[PDB]
């Protein structure tokens, strides 16, 4: 009956408690603090006329794609603040965007339950739709390219699906969440990915096998953002209860919590740095926060914006940080 | 700038043309009147005369109207309702022939309290529709005034928004009333933009 499930859930907690010998508070005591760090808006990206919910950095750390409610995808240069491309979307209700690792495609999705892939390099000189993905009952919230012809999508129907662009059909379907799935993050080796849901829980998936490896709890509110550590052995979680925390895949625990009494708003986007000792979180009180990510102490504030910060992103070389917001502006910090 | 090459100048020209196209599209997108349709409840009857997000288009006196139906989104509204922050007006449909049964009236008032006092639709007006009138006639004016006032008082921010109420007026009144409410909302919006208030 259901007694075995309760006993197994109790014993997995007992096994979890048998490994927590030292939390991530006493291990890092002799380490020098980062200290106060200041970033200035090197570039401001104007051209959007509505709320921005998603931005993605290119692989070359120069190009950038952003989405907004005006039915527009804009590709920026970010060095000379030019606009490489402007892609009009059929559905103006978009909440996610992606950039292919090869630089040949971009993806978008939202309330229309449709993931669209656009070809950026055609002989005709214009960007056109290459494939449309259908099969999600709920609205899509995140999409990330695995390779040139493989994408993973997260929707609001408590499911995650692995697609094949060539045939336009679901290759693998990931099920097991009891709430709306909000965020996705791909591992550096592109063999695993983590998923955040509105059931206050996140779990690790396997792309090849197609089944969940482990699940992580601890939050008491819906998860909004997720991202791995650069080494791929850890990931950070953002939720609406003003708390960010870090989980370890090998330890299957929660390491440190990044919270403060002055903050009561929710976290919308998170992102690490190149070395991993700088976690950046976008909050709902109109300013980003910069965290030590190893001592749970704030070390910077990005207060340039005048509305809710919705998306964050660092470059692959770590040279800059791009943030979007609900005031239709993107700012490059360095 | 004298420090640019020829290709950089051509790229800047392309970026300027993109900017011009974006402005010329946003200008045309600022003449759409954005309506969000809600209910529980006769919404089909309200749209009859004139998968994800549903839409509808119709023209009345040179105004182009967008309606949105959210009955097909079987998910919690706390995640995607902020996408509609900025609509001209919110249409709300309530059927009067549910006062004595098990009670849809209490659910309707709870939904109204949740949507009228929402933290995002603080400055968005609410167009309120009493759909059922023939069925409600069976088991009058005092009761209708009572129900109207009862639905009216839930407005917590009683200064920054107005709740226009109709009594659908079987034919053709439904559109005209929305046109009058949209014109009034636009007029009062401009005074806020210019500071004339």
């Amino acid at each position: 009956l259901r007694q075995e499930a309760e006993q197994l859930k109790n014993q997995i907690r007992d096994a979890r408690k048998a490994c927590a010998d030292a939390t991530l508070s006493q291990i890092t005591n002799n380490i020098d603090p980062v200290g106060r760090i200041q970033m200035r808006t090197r570039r401001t990206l104007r051209g959007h006329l509505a709320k921005i919910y998603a931005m993605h950095w290119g692989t070359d750390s120069r190009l950038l794609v952003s989405a907004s409610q005006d039915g527009k995808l804009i590709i920026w240069d970010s060095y000379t603040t030019n606009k490489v491309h402007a892609i009009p979307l059929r559905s103006s209700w978009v909440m996610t965007c992606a950039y292919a690792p090869s630089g040949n495609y971009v993806a978008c999705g939202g309330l229309d339950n449709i993931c669209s892939i656009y070809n950026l390099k055609t002989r005709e000189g214009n960007v056109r739709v290459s494939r449309e993905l259908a099969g999600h009952t709920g609205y899509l919230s995140c999409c990330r390219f695995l390779d040139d012809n493989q994408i993973v999508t997260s929707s609001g129907d408590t499911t995650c699906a692995l697609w094949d662009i060539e045939t336009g059909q679901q290759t693998t379907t990931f099920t097991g969440h009891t709430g709306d799935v909000m965020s996705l993050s791909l591992a550096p080796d592109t063999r695993l990915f983590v998923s955040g849901a509105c059931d206050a829980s996140a779990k690790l998936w396997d792309v090849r096998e197609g089944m969940c490896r482990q699940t992580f709890t601890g939050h008491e509110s819906d998860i909004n953002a997720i991202c791995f550590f650069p080494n791929g052995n850890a990931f950070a979680t953002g939720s609406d209860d003003a708390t960010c925390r870090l989980f370890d895949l090998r330890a299957d625990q929660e390491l440190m919590t990044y919270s403060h009494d002055n903050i009561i708003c929710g976290i919308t986007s998170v992102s690490f740095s190149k070395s991993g000792r700088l976690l950046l979180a976008g909050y709902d009180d109109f300013n980003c926060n910069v965290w030590d990510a190893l001592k749970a102490d704030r070390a910077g504030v990005l207060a340039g914006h005048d509305n809710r910060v919705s998306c964050l992103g660092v470059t692959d070389d770590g040279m800059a940080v791009a943030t979007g917001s609900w005031d239709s502006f993107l700012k490059i910090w360095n | 700038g004298c420090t640019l090459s020829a290709e950089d100048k051509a790229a800047v020209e392309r970026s300027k043309m993109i900017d011009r196209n974006l402005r010329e599209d946003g200008e045309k997108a600022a003449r759409e009147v954005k309506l969000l349709l809600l209910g529980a409840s006769g919404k089909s009857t309200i749209v009859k005369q004139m998968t994800g997000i549903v839409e509808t288009h119709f023209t009345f006196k040179d105004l182009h109207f967008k309606m949105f139906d959210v009955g097909g989104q079987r998910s919690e509204r706390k995640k995607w309702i902020h996408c509609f922050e900025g609509v001209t007006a919110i249409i709300f449909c309530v059927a009067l022939s549910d006062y004595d049964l098990v009670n849809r009236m209490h659910e309707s008032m709870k939904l109204f309290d949740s949507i009228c006092n929402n933290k995002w639709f603080t400055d968005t007006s609410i167009i309120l529709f009493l759909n059922k009138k023939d069925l409600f006639e069976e088991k009058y004016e005092e009761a209708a005034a009572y129900i109207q006032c009862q639905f009216e008082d839930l407005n917590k921010r009683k200064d920054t928004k107005e709740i226009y109420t109709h009594f659908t007026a079987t034919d053709t009144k439904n559109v005209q009333f929305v046109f009058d409410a949209v014109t009034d909302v636009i007029i009062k919006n401009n005074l806020k933009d210019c500071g004339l208030f």
Partner: single-chain antibody, 227 residues
């Protein structure tokens, strides 16, 4: 992607003649268009240029004033108005499409060509090289000044013109390889001296090779090396 040209023929000196190019198969409204002419003697000479939005127009300092370039984006047609034609205007005229953003190929497609009968210096010391297939060849050309801009771009382009055929882009910005070109070709250089290296030469590599600069208008071509 196909450009068809018309307007050529025989014209008496001192007259006028209009050339038209009909674009088809691509978004002509987002491409800048050049005109490049070729005399019966081996060589190339840039003539004019019109921007994507018709806001920028350039000419070479030899036909400026008497030549007019125009486009009609509704009709997808490019025009070149020529007046007071001299005896030195007998050339084979080509239409070249151009798009300019970060990472684009500005001289990828050339037209079929039309015939009419009536500054930085790029030099190519080599004129002809006898060679057999399967042997690697090196083609080098020098520049009057350094082509490396401060932003890191070396504006050098490479073109191959097979006999009885239109020129084709091979290398753009002196490093990158054009699409549809086999990886046998390779480009290299440093500031002033540049070289083009071809490995495993095949029977389709015969032709004349030109190196073109794009640092500042007017654009200047090389002499041409025959293989």
């Amino acid at each position: 992607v196909q450009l068809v040209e018309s307007g050529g023929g025989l014209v008496q000196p001192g007259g006028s003649r209009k050339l038209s190019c009909s674009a088809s198969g691509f978004a002509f409204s987002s491409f800048g268009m050049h005109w490049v002419r070729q005399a019966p003697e081996k060589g190339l000479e840039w003539v004019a240029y019109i921007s994507s939005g018709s806001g920028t127009i350039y000419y070479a300092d030899t036909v400026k004033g008497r030549f007019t370039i125009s486009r009609d984006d509704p009709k997808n047609t490019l025009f070149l108005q020529m007046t007071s034609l001299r005896s030195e205007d007998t050339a084979m005229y080509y239409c070249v499409r151009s798009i300019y953003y970060y990472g684009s190929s500005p001289f990828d497609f050339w037209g079929q060509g039309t015939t009419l009968t009536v500054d930085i210096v790029m030099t190519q010391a080599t004129s002809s090289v006898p060679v057999t297939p399967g042997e690697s060849v090196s083609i080098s050309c020098r520049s009057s000044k350094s082509l490396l801009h401060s932003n890191g771009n070396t504006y050098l382009y490479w073109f191959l013109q097979r006999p009885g055929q239109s020129p084709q882009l091979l290398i753009y910005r002196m490093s990158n390889l054009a699409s549809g070109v086999p990886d046998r070709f390779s480009g290299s250089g440093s500031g002033t001296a540049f070289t083009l290296t071809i490995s495993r030469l095949e029977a389709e590599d015969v032709g004349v090779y030109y190196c073109m600069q794009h640092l500042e208008y007017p654009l200047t071509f090389g002499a041409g090396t025959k293989l």
